[PDB]
Amino acid sequence: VSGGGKKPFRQKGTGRARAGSIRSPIWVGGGKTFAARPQDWSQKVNRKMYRGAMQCILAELVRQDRLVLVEEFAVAAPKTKELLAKLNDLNAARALIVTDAVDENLYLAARNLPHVDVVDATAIDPVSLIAFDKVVMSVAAAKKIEVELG
Amino acid sequence: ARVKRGVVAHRRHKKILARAKGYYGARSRVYRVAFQAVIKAGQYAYRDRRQKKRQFRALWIARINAGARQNGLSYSRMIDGLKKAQVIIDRRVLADIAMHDAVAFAALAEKAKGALA
RNA sequence: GUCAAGUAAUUAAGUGCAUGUGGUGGAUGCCUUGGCAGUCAGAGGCGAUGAAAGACGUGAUAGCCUGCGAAAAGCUCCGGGGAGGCGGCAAAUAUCCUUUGAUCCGGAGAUGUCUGAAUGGGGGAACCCACCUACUUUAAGGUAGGUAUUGCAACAUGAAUACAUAGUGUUGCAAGGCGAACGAGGGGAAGUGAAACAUCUCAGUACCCUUAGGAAAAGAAAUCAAUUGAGAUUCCCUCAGUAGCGGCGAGCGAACGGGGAUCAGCCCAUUAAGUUAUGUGUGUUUUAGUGGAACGCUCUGGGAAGUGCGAACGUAGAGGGUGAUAUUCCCGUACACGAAAGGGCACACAUAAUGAUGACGAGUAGGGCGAGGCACGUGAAACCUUGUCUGAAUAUGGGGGGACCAUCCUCCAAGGCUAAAUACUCCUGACUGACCGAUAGUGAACCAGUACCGUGAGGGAAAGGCGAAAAGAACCCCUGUGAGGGGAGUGAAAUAGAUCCUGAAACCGCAUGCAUACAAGCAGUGGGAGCACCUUCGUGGUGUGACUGCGUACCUUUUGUAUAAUGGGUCAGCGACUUAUAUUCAGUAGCGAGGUUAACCGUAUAGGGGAGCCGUAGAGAAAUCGAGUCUUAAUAGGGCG
RNA sequence: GAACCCACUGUCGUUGAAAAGCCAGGGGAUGACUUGUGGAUAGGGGUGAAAGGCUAAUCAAGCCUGGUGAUAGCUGGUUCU
RNA sequence: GCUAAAACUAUGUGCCGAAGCUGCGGAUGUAUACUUUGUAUACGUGGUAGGGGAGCGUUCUGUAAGCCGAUGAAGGUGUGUUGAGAAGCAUGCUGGAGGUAUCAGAAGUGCGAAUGCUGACGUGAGUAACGACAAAACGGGUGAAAAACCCGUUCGCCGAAAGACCAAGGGUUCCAGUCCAACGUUAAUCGGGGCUGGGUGAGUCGACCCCUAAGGCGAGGCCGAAAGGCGUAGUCGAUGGGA
RNA sequence: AUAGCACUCUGCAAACACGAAAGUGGACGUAUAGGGUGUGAUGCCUGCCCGGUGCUGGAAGGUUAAUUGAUGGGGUUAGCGUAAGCGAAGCUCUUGAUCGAAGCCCCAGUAAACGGCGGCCGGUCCUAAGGUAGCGAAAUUCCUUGUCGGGUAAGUUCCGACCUGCACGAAUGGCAUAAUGAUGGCGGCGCUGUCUCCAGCAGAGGCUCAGUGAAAUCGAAAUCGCUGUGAAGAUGCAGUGUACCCGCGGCUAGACGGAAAGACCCCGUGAACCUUUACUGCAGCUUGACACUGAACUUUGAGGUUCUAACUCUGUCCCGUGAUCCGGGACGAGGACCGUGUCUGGUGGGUAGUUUGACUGGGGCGGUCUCCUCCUAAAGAGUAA
RNA sequence: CCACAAGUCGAGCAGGUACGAAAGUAGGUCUUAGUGAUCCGGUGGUUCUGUAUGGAAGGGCCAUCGCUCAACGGAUAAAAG
RNA sequence: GGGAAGCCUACCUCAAGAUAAGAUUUCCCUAGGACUUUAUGUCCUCUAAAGAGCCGUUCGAGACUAGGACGUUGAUAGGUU
Incomplete structure (x- = not known):
């Protein structure tokens, strides 16, 4: 997220909850806690399992x-x-x-x-x-x- | 798949506030205070479902004592006499008869003291 | 009738609960000219012929945005198209233009102020001050051109100093600056881990500097291998977390061999492949566009695309719009056509030029001292680079095979050029999503890098929605010719009336019913009289709750909390065990003494691809044996099987 | 002893008129004086008649942006049945 | 409150007294037999840190060119009803266009607390305060409205500044007409507020220009891994000199 | 800080400082000048100690670096041997004799260099030496409000004097001193609301009315006293006493009142900055070897004399040139030195990164930390301080 | 005996011994304290390995040496305020 | 029986919210209809007393209140003599 490099205010003395950045996931407008990335959703199918499934489908x-x-x-x-x-x-x-x-x-x-x-x-x-x-x-x-054979 | 919480959260809070109807001040308006109030009410109800039986037995025993002392017996002596005479009518019915039918209670006391004799 | 005792009913300054009806506020639902991540195909630059980025002007009205530049919302030509048009906020109005073809779309030209590498000098950017030519003016000017520096070349001129050189000038050519990522080179940390820390790690990472190209770099063995075999470079899968390195700590981590992608070699003075420009030819692609099928009746309704009944087209049932949900209403879609002019790419010819100061490689290989690189930290340390000092032989020669020697095998350094397979996205076109839907998604859906903060580098917001169509409320009344409202009128709807879809909660009013001014505390809970309304008249429903038994909130942290220990003013929205890889165990499915492919190819979830991995045999440090093996003189005993 | 430059005592002020002041008194006031304009010195550095003073209301090592989501055997929090 | 007790010692007979035991109804875990059964019997069912098992709801994909919908979807607000629970179902009012069975599949999947983040609104409370103790009073005018505006008559304060100018800095605040929502610590007819229109005239004033100080830059040059440092000739630079 | 005083360094291309270097300040100055250090007008003065650390000067004795490479021992193969084995040369691994500077060890001087000026009962031990002048219950004195004198009715403060100075003392200066000080202590006159002991009055708030309109805090409140209980000091628990409902002006005893995740204390194998004879690096300074680096004569490998041609000049003159830079040329003064590169010994809080244990009736100081025997140890084993 | 790493007792079998005529006794001493893991190196032996091959260097195996690592299960070769 | 500055009275002030709300003197109000929830019943018409307050002039009473005096049949305040 853009910005967010500086500490918003000092650690002690102000009476506020301590904070390190204005882009913390707790804050509105901050980063997402666990940000997603592009994924690959393909699985491996055994050759024999695939052929057997096709045979069963055709027989049914x-x-x-x-x-x-x-x-x-x-x-x-x-x-x-x-x-x-x-x-x-x-x-x-x-x-x-x-x-x-x-x-x-x-x-x-x-x-x-x-x-x-x-x-x-x-x-x-x-x-x-x-x-x-x-x-x-x-x-x-x-x-x-x-x-x-299917 | 982004999920918004508004509808379900509103339903839950509204159910709690509906169960908190009739309480004083923030206890029927503010969700936090109302939620604490409903749990305590449930705990009290659980305890009082046990306390009720003791309270009503005490009431029956007091009324039977009054009737017995009207007929010249004490409660303990009347109970012992009925047990010896083998009558198995319970205290709830005995107190009902003591309240609403003096003659029948007098007959019961006569039976008890006859068995005691 | 008086008196006396006893005992009911009757008040609400205000308050509590319930219900009705409002206000404030802007959640929720539905929606989207805004984002996010990709696939395929392009392109990979602009600039002294003055760039990126700006200032100022330019309009009938002219503030801002957009376009444009004193020829200033535009000028000229060519092509397309055929009835409206004078850019937007943003309506009205006026003058108007246009079938003698406007607005609009594509291509090629003309013009193009000032600042900015800024280049005539200077300077606080958008300003101040100049000189020289040619033409023009008669007054105190105007037009156009020129006047920077550095490097190279030619020419001229020219000191100390005699020839000369240094220096100086003129002409011609070239360069400078900007901009995403990727490449190459010059310098180069620390937080952290080691449960401290200095060797080590982090890591040649972050960062700074220089400089290319569409890619760059590398590249044709003084290379590996060890059956005497392979055969330039680059990238991917294995080998393998193996061999090794390591305060032998934390950690770091190969190669050989095998399987793929792509495949290519050519020269050192008469000199090659290849590459770059220019022109021609051929082919393709691209920058406007044209045609493009087929529906009626009935019911509900403000409105039909919706109900019911029948019909038609389909190489077109993709998508968008139209008053609710459309293949046959509109724009489109499949398909078939189309280019004055310009651009890209491909192949082939002609001319240049480059390759190409270089002809077999001497201050070189090797060595002493100090460092760096190799998975490899001085180690048994080979090999590569060199700051310092030295220093061969030269094909009967020389380098390597991890200290070193001998034998064998292999190659020829001290000179060069070279495509593909590989890396990336500021940008362009088309398409896609078990990606977001206004607290989300870019910081920015809206006049946002703006308002605002800071001397400055820099930091950095909030803010979407009337209605199908303004049909945006003529006229009357109260009021200050105000604000605001009440009628009338429009609309399907006005509690859709302008910060206008829906309109939740906290919070604040008015109204009705009951309770409440002699009674002490987490405010409830179990009983329970009376009253008011409803009523199937009840052993019923709704509201209230006199009197009464019991009863010291929640979370966290603790041996232990009502604790006078912590946290919370309240509501609404957001807010915390994930993702990738490896490994082990358990379920479940396929095959089964066998099971299974990886990269890659493949118009591609298929089918090929068997390299490799796990299982099938242990013992020993190892050589070696093997249902046995190790120890031992032992066949004894014993350990692992 | 006025202007001007300072800051010794006291009251008030302390959500101030004011993030350092007002009022009544106080010191220097031709000098090692006060002051305008324009310049120089930059962060393990500067400057200091020396208090670790000052260096933009910030100083036993200024501010900004990056390494960076530093590390935390510590404290808090962790949502339906 | 209690004295031949309602105290103490000893004995006896009754009774009260818990979520313990018993009675009646219901649910669930494990095991043994019925040789599927969902059935009977037996024993169990307080729980922090933890371990195990089974489920409810939310968003999206397929099933789905299906099913529901202007004869009214989602959302909001009441009422009734069902289950052991998370929850489900039906319907009145509002709303005005979408919703989605079953069985699979994937998660931005459930909030009261973190001196959590953003917005809105409370309590304190109609409370403190309204910024130098130089000071005001009346008549008339205008106006919807006058303590504060205008005119007039009195009173008071400053006068080495509380008056008059210049530089720096600011930028239209200057003048006239018109308006009072917001701004002005009150009202306002007034204003440095909104709107419309005006206004800055130089040979002699200042700047520009000529000249230079501190200092800056700097052709060549010296030095440095690069970026760069310093500096000669020059060229800028007023706070000073020049009609 | 200061005028004055003292020590010390610096011969000019000065020492010193900034800078990576070029260069710049010192200074367009020249020992009557410039830098560093301490003391602080003036008057009287300024005692003893050179053992320690430092600085200065000697020594060429002992120790020591790079460089150099004499000897000795291995590896390998031509060959000699039946075999075992032996084995030159050449390559190679190692060993390391000799030469080798500064520093250090050693000897002197130096205190207005850093420092020191004693013990134990007249004596004694020990030192490098054991305090001179002057002052002293002090800005220094624990005991202590020492003792005596003065001041007061009464003086832990003040002044004078005494001296068993816990623990003064001579340029980290001693004892005084006119003048000066918004400087510390004590005592007087005048004067007063400072006080006995407060009273009246004037202005500004406070209070009431009209207009505008905050703040910190806040789990929710139907928010009394007492005695007791209890996470040990209760509005909310137990018993009991008292009390009709609600404002306004005052007040501050409690709500362990508000404000700031205690700064004191401890802990974390946290941080930062500072010091040193803590550890380990580096800059800076300094020594020798090799290179830049040459020639000719001598002496006992080294030393000496001379020369110029490398190299130096922040020396003069000329040209580029209108120029205190720079370059070229001509002189002059130096000269194989100085200086720089690589290697190497020394010095090195100037600077940098870090370390500096735990137990513990809080921590520190003290003690302890591994092994054996007895008791605690409750008739098996084991069992803490 | 014991968390691990470690520690303790041991009949008997084979070979070679010593003392007894012999049956036999002897794997240190009446017993329980007299101690230090791993890493890195040194010395003796070896029918192990040996980066093309033969050797060698280096490594392995068996035996043994160098700890007040005494904060004695031993954070580094090297550390005070 | 006696017996203290101590206790209860006695002296001064407050005191019936003493919900147990006490006592005494004096004064005031003596009208008609409709209906059903037939009751101290609810609605119409008439009536409005004894007194209290608002307001005004004010105080030796006072923060605001409260309290005291007076309001033409009058000396309550100002003025005048």
Whole structure:
């Protein structure tokens, strides 16, 4: 805090409580007692623990019937209405779409849809797998995730 | 996450001041004095919940003594006579009867002195 | 009816409690043209062609702020844009400008007083006094240019002193000052710890001085290693709190080897890579901008974006605003276009110049004396620097491998240049936050480094909020043509009426109900009559409390406190066990005789990266052995396993 | 013995008219005198007919800013059930 | 207050008397059996320094483009009600736009004290005091209001300063009109107060200028790790000389 | 402080002081001058001691530094040896003979240098020497209000004198002294409200009314006396006595009243400043060795004589130049000295950083601090002052 | 016996001894006081180590020496008011 | 029975807040309605006594108060003689 170098008044004789600086944390306008600094909040996760958690999440989704397997999922043109109809026929209005590769047309079509996101097979994360109501997965993506074992 | 204390602190102080209603001067206006006053009131209540039983037993014994001496007995002799006669009516009911029904108390005293004889 | 005894009711000068209604005061809640910390990408300077920082002027009205400079809220040209505009506090008003294209936005020019390195001399900064040229005036002046010092170069001139040199002058060129952090170099403490203190530590830290660049420094082995192997410099992870140093105290603390980031070498007189300027060419980026989809009805309401019912766009459901909560009302967003003129960066050519007084390194290596640096404090002390005194050989030669000698291995000093990986943020653009929300966050959200204090260096505040829109209360009344209020009127709301959202507490009034003027103390607590109001009429509710038993505050510190031991006038707001790293133990989860990665790469919480760490075997000072080992002559005994 | 320069006694004043004074008396008053303007000496230093006196109401080592959040085996305080 | 006691000695029969014991209702810790149980039985439940266990509230992040809200959120102020507690819930009035379940996550997470910090307001108390004991009185005027302003008639005080000038220092305080909220230790129509407008005229007065003292700076120069010290020629510097 | 007095240093580029140096003051002075130290007009004067510390002068005897490096002993390898082992030279580790100054030890002088001027019963011991003049119950005398005289009715003060001076004394001056002093003590005249013993009066406050309007303090108060109890001196506890509610003018006995985290005392392994023959450094001063540093003749490694060319001059003249700086040149006087750098011995409260124990019927002074035996010690062990 | 660091008693086993004919006795003295940790150095020995290698210097291990550190569990090599 | 400057009376002053609030003399007030909480009941109209005070002139009484005298039917104060 700016200033505060000098003793405000002498140690004895004035009748006041003794003080050393006008920027003491007791005083209004003084420094904070334990001042914070920038922090790093990342934790370490064991590789095996992460992979096991992903496996458990996928198995729970399967046995809860929130994972929908589809042979092929492609879009003809970058059209939000076309994508919306394609998801509505599958009954997956709120969904995360996982594909072996991310087609630019599909990405552009999905960008503006609320509660719809599209990811590559190698970019799935545990929070995304849980947040969405359904996960629509292609067979090729399922095979790659199989090879990676979650 | 900076936390302000105003709402909770105000609620606590207001509850203490509400419990301090009716006291004299600063005891019902000033938080420090009011807070000291409420604790002392609680301590007094705890002690007096024990003192009350003794005070009421003393009152009953005095009234029974008056009735017995009206009927020609002392309190101790009347109690001993009732114990010997096996009557187990307690002092609260005995004092109530002494206050409100002279004839029944006279009958009880007759029973006690008959057992003493 | 008189008299006499006994015993009720009736007063409030003032006060207490409760409730109602106010005042003062400015907490709380909600909010934000202000802060804090970062990521990505730039940039890393300005100045004698006069800087940073200031003084004074400049307006129809002109005090302050902003802009500008006697051409003075502006002038000229080029480009954009298409209906308002004459900067803000700050309304009104006037004169006005503008589709013959204003205001406004971007680029390039013109002008640019005085002080300040200030540079014609001087000086108490914003002032005083000059000289010389050219033109101009006829009076006592005006215009423009010039007139500092130091260093270098050329020229001229020139003493003691004969040649000369010193000195002196003219011309041309260059430098000085300022500013955040980072770099390099010259000097360099003490508080503190060691539970005292002097060696030591703190620490080459704080501070002072000089001086660069966008980075700097270092750098191509007279280097390490010890299987005869590696191969310039810099930075990160390990090795490792190990080997060592140390009043062997407190403490200080490596290297070798391994894993990464980045990778690059070139010359000493005919002389290289590289770097810096100038011009040209090509490519990219940047300094204004243009277009840019799609909503209706009904209910509540002051107001609809809110309820209910249906519809449309989406490469656009980011954000902001509009009278309450909007993808379809406005500005915008995704996307697609766009530059007269100027700037940056990249690559390639031409010319300069530099590299580049230097051609294999002598007062040098080594030595005696005193110091300093190396993790290393004189130690068994190698190696580096040198204040003083000395002093080689020179490839059949010389340096090193931690005292010293021999053998081996390795390198060639006494001459130079060199990018990247690394360090930082005065500043610019965009974006972000389990950061703050007016006692917080910068000292400063507001005309703040201001008011104020000090001779001076210096120190250093407080102060945000009417309403959607001023629609900011015409007119009447009391009053001093005042202040203040009462009506009327505006507004959804005026107890939103100007220091105006909400309006808590301390503190101070008025009103009603009950108690209170014969009675002694932490002011309550357990009982308890009477009264007033309400009432489901009650074994009910609210207020009060005659009379009565018991009863000497709180905190701290102490053997022990009502203590006449400490602290507190009261209220509201703020105020004290945290953060990073290492280690040990306990829970819990994964894997399990195995477990786990670090730096780093990676459009990146994934996936790679096995160097390293812990566990799996002890004994011994150690060499050495090993389910054993040490001691011993001992296979005895015994200690650790 | 006036001006001027001092400060020996007493009363008052002591939240003063005043952070050193007023009143009544007192000393020197041509000298080692008093005084204006402008200069010099700077902190382990200055100056001192010497009291550790004075050096901006501060002196057995001035003031300001930094080291600095010095250290304190001492005192105080430490917030819901 | 007490004397064949209400004193002392000895004996006896009753009674009073504690938060001790018993009775009735409720809560909780540990252990043993029911071979989950939340159930019975048994033994426990005063506590400073300390150790252990379990919870309540506050701010922010996800869940949350969800749920509540102008038919009224947060905040403020009453009332009723629930739990063993920190606390929870419902609703009248005020207020006028936000709030946030559940389960996880992170903390600027709880104040009565530190002669603690900032602001506001009390008690003393309508108390002390209103700053030289040179001194005032009356008539008229103006004005809402006159002991204090203006005019007039009397009285008193200074007169080597309580009068008249200059330097330093200050900076509009000078003059006129107008106003009285704040300032003036009272009121004020008055003012050194607010507002508006005026006012400073030099060859001879002073400054500037010429000249120098103490002293300062100082081309070259001497000296010093750097910064710098001293100093020659010069150049400044009045408190002095020059119409 | 002072005029006067004394001691001492200083030969001029003075001693001394400031400054890192250049340089500046001393001083534009020259021993009748300048610095330091003590005493303090004047009159009479100023005794004894040189053992100690200091200062001055000698000595070349003993001790001692850097420098120098004679001897002795190890390490290593050519080679000689069956082996053990031996082992030159060369490098290297160590040992340290000889030379070597000042200082110190030693010998004298010095007190207007710092200092000293006794003991124990006439005597004796011991000293370096044992107080001269003058003065003395004093600015010095504990005992002490010593004793005597004067003053007073009565005098712990005053004056005179005496002298068993606890513990005067001659330039840290002795004894006096005219004049002088807002100087200390004592006694008189006049005078008085200083007092016996206070009274009256005048002005300014106090008090009342109108206007403005503070302060320190403060846990909360429905805030009596007495005797007792009690963290040991009670408004608040126990017993008892007294007392209707509330102001105003006075008063200061209590509220251990207000004010300032006691300054006395102790403690902290706190602070600061001052002193010294406390410890350890440094500045300053001083000695020798090496360098700057040369030549020619002599004597018994050292000493001497001479020279000039290094170097010095706060000496003269000339030039830059209009100049008491500075530089160059010419002279003159010195001269291998002086002086400076590195190394080294000595001195060094000038200056700096620090240390200087604890127990303890408070602290200090005294005593104690580790080990063995007995008692206290209560019939096992252990048990404090 | 004991906070630690320390202290005390000890049968018996192996080797080499002395005295006794022998069974045997002897690891100082009737016992309990006669003492000083660590660090740093000195001397003797050693089938330990030895910074490229062979040596060496230095270090280790075993035995032993230098304390009125007496404020005697011993703050420094070195300290009064 | 006697018996002291000592005790209670006696002398002077205060004294019924002596809540136990005492005593004596003298003086004053003798009207109508409405209603319900049917009671020393509350509201209207009429009435206002004996006295006390405010105010004024003042005091040998006085800080302010209190106390004493007087207010035209009058000597209370000033003036006048």
